[PDB]
Design a protein around this ligand. Structure first.
Ligand SMILES: Nc1ccn([C@@H]2O[C@H](COP(=O)(O)CP(=O)(O)OP(=O)(O)O)[C@@H](O)[C@H]2O)c(=O)n1
Ligand SMILES: [Ca+2]
Length: 349
C-alpha cells in the first residue's frame, strides 16, 4: 500500500523566492472558502449515536476484563480522536487498558478473550514497542486498537484536547486538515509510508504556535498553569483550561486565512532540512542541536512532546517526503484560489 512510488526519487524541492509567493487570499476567495469550510466542518462533526457507542465499547471491555481477571483494578479509557475532540463518525477507536497487573501486557491473552466473546477480526501485535490488539465490534460497528498501560498516549491525547479547548478555530481547522489527509491518503504511517494522524495534528499545533500573534501557547512551558492530575502528579503541560482559553484571541485571522497559511507554511515557508517542529517548546529547534541529522527518515522532524527522542516524522523516507511536500504544494495552489473541493479530491492509485 505504498503511497509515494520510488519513481518519484528523493530530490528536495527548491525554495521559491518569498517575494513571489502569494501571501493573502482575495476577499472573494476568503468569503467562499470560509463558507465552504464551515459547511464541511458541520458534516464532519460526530453524531450522538456513534459517540455513545464509543463509550459503550469502553464499558463493555471493562466488564469483560474484570470478569475474566478480577481484583486487578483494570480500567479502560478512550484516547486518540475519540478523546481529543477531533473524531468524526468514521474514526477508529483508540483504547488504553490500565492496570497494576503487568501480566496483562502480554496482549495475546486479551485477543483470545475477545474472540471468545464475539469480537471479529481479532489480531494482535505482541512484540511491537507498544503491543496492540485490534478488533471489529460487530454490534457497535467500531474498529478498535487497544494497548495496555501506554499512559503516555493518554497524556498526549489530553494535551491535544487542551489545545483544541483553547481557541475556537482549532477544532474546525484540524478536522478539515485531517479530512484532507484521509482523502489524499497521506495519513497511513504503517501501510503507506506517510504520516500518522497524530503527526499531522502536531504539525497543525506547531503552525498555530508560530502565528503572529500566536493562536496557541506552548503548554509544556507554561509551568504556572499546570494542575495536579487525577493520579496526583503535576501535569507535564499547562491544563487549566479557563485560564488558558482566549490565549489566541488577539490573532483575528479567519479559519479560511488559517487554512491558507497552514499550507503556505508547510508548502513554502518551513525549512525542512534545517529545523525540527517542537510543540513542547513552541519555537523551532534545529536538527543539529538534537543530533537528528543522523536519524533514518529525518526529512521531516516533528518532535514528540513527551519523548524528545521520538521523531513523529520517522515513518516517511526521503521519497515519501518528496511526495508529501508535493501534495502540500498542490494544496497550497488550490486553497490559494479557494478550491477546497478540488484540494480534498480522493486520491486514486
Ligand atoms: N506516533 C504516535 C502516534 C499515535 N500516538 C497516540 O495514538 C493516538 C492515536 O493516533 P492517531 O494517529 O490515530 C490520531 P487521531 O486523532 O485518533 O486520528 P484519527 O481520527 O485519524 O484516527 C494519539 O492521540 C496518540 O495518543 C502516539 O502516541 N504516537
Ligand atoms: Ca485514531
Amino acid at each position: 500500500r505504498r503511497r509515494m512510488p520510488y519513481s518519484l526519487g528523493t530530490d528536495k524541492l527548491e525554495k521559491v523566492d518569498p517575494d513571489k509567493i502569494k501571501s493573502k487570499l482575495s476577499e472573494d476567495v476568503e468569503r467562499k472558502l470560509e463558507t465552504d469550510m464551515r459547511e464541511l466542518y458541520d458534516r464532519l462533526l460526530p453524531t450522538e449515536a456513534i459517540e455513545v457507542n464509543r463509550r459503550e465499547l469502553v464499558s463493555k471491555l471493562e466488564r469483560l476484563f474484570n470478569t475474566e481477571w478480577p481484583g486487578h483494578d483494570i480500567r479502560v479509557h478512550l484516547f486518540g480522536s475519540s478523546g481529543n475532540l477531533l473524531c468524526s463518525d468514521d474514526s477508529d477507536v483508540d483504547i488504553c487498558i490500565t492496570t497494576p497487573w503487568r501480566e496483562l501486557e502480554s496482549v495475546c491473552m486479551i485477543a483470545e478473550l475477545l474472540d471468545r466473546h464475539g469480537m471479529e477480526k481479532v489480531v494482535c501485535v505482541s512484540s511491537a514497542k507498544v503491543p496492540i490488539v485490534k478488533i471489529w465490534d460487530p454490534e457497535l460497528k467500531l474498529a478498535c486498537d487497544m494497548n495496555v498501560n501506554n499512559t503516555l498516549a493518554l497524556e498526549n491525547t489530553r494535551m491535544v484536547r487542551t489545545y483544541v479547548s483553547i481557541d475556537d478555530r482549532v477544532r474546525p481547522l484540524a478536522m478539515i486538515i485531517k479530512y484532507w489527509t484521509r482523502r489524499r491518503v497521506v495519513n497511513d504511517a504503517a501501510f503507506g509510508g506517510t504520516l500518522s494522524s497524530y503527526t499531522w495534528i502536531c504539525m497543525i499545533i506547531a503552525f498555530l504556535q508560530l502565528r503572529d500573534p500566536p493562536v496557541l501557547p506552548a503548554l509544556h512551558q507554561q509551568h504556572d498553569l499546570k494542575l495536579v492530575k487525577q493520579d496526583g502528579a503535576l501535569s507535564d503541560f499547562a491544563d487549566d483550561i479557563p485560564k488558558l482559553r482566549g490565549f489566541g484571541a488577539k490573532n483575528k485571522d479567519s479559519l479560511a486565512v488559517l487554512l491558507f497559511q497552514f499550507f503556505r507554511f508547510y508548502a513554502h515557508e518551513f525549512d525542512y532540512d534545517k529545523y525540527t517542529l517542537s510543540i513542547r517548546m513552541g519555537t523551532l529547534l534545529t536538527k543539529a542541536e538534537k543530533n537528528w541529522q543522523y536519524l533514518v527518515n529525518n526529512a521531516l522532524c516533528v518532535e514528540e512532546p513527551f519523548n524528545d527522542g521520538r521523531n513523529l516524522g520517522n515513518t516517511a523516507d526521503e521519497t515519501s517526503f518528496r511526495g508529501l511536500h508535493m501534495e502540500l504544494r498542490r494544496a497550497f495552489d488550490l486553497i490559494a484560489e479557494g478550491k477546497l473541493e478540488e484540494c480534498c479530491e480522493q486520491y486514486v492509485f
